[PDB]
Amino acid sequence: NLVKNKCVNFNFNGLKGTGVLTESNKKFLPFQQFGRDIADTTDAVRDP
């Protein structure tokens, strides 16, 4: 099971990331997995 607003070292299908998970108001398609900003840090992830 996943957590919301509770920092963890989450592994979304091989993607290891740390931080707080907050709901996103920008919506791509779920198959479109993740993006990166100007700093190239991962910005979002979709869970199965």
Partner: peptide, 20 residues
């Protein structure tokens, strides 16, 4: 402001934009 553009640390200015 309009024209300017993990493991990274930025410390806030001791004098923020407001105080500057």
């Amino acid at each position: 402001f309009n024209k300017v553009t993990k493991g990274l640390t930025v410390l806030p200015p001791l004098l923020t934009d407001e105080m500057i």
